[PDB]
Ligand binder design. Structure first.
Ligand SMILES: CC(=O)N[C@@H]1[C@@H](O)[C@H](O)[C@@H](CO)O[C@H]1O
Ligand SMILES: [Zn+2]
Ligand SMILES: [Zn+2]
Lengths: 118, 118
């Protein structure tokens, strides 16, 4: 779920909190417009991954609790995860991994969406 | 669905672009923290509303298309709606009505979420 994703994010980017991504670019937060950078892209895909998992049955990303592990910046989803948990978990770890590698631009945080995300 | 909710808003608050509500306070765009004002609380009740609707198997509140009528400040969800659609429609409608009765504080638009809702 999102609670586990928030923490996944910290595993790979301990120097930051999920909040730095809560309101970044045109996607890290909800969804709309043209990506702003690599980071803002990591978020586009993540959401896509989620709506793809919503296609799994009775699968709710933000709410299904999965079994994962964090070991010194590296994430691992465990095997005992149901088809839904495993898909979501992966979505989240790939997003987390994508965030750590992308550049963080202060200029693209807290932006006026009504002017950059149409 | 999102598009329908956007219309209810333009319905109850014609003097504003629906973007004025895509990043207001801590909840309009749906997150967490202390509501900043009446309007923000409106959004707070709306997200929680969506969260309850999600408990109905197969109910995707951001996407469920429902039957409603929005006639000059007047919003009506039609009976021909099933449990999921009926619940979703009442969420949007009530939130749309709520916005119409709460002052809109320019200060509270695009605020720092990391620092103000955490
Ligand atoms: C396009 C649209 O209306 N999106 C709504 C937004 O207006 C509302 O402020 C927010 C929070 O409750 O939820 C979004 O789904
Ligand atoms: Zn913002
Ligand atoms: Zn009519």
């Amino acid at each position: 779920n999102i609670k586990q994703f928030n923490n996944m994010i910290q595993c790979t980017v301990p120097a930051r909190s999920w909040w730095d991504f809560a309101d970044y670019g045109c996607y890290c937060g909800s969804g709309s417009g043209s990506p702003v950078d690599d980071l803002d892209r990591c978020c586009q895909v993540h959401d896509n991954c989620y709506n793809a998992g919503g296609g799994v049955t009775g699968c709710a990303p933000k709410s299904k609790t999965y079994t994962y592990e964090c070991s010194q910046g590296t994430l691992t989803c465990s095997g005992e995860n149901s088809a839904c948990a495993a898909t979501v978990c992966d979505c989240d770890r790939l997003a987390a991994i994508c965030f750590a590698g992308a550049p963080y631009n202060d200029n693209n945080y807290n932006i006026d969406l009504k002017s950059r995300c149409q | 669905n999102t598009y329908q909710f956007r219309n209810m808003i333009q319905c109850t608050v014609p003097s504003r672009s629906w973007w004025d509500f895509a990043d207001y306070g801590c909840y309009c765009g749906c997150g967490s923290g202390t509501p900043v004002d009446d309007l923000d609380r409106c959004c707070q009740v709306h997200c929680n509303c969506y969260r309850q609707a999600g408990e109905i198997s197969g109910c995707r509140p951001k996407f469920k298309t429902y039957t409603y009528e929005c006639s000059g400040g007047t919003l009506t969800c039609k009976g021909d709606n099933n449990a999921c659609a009926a619940s979703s429609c009442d969420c949007d409608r009530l939130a749309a009505i709520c916005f119409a009765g709460a002052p809109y504080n320019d200060n509270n638009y695009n605020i720092d979420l990391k620092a103000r809702c955490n």
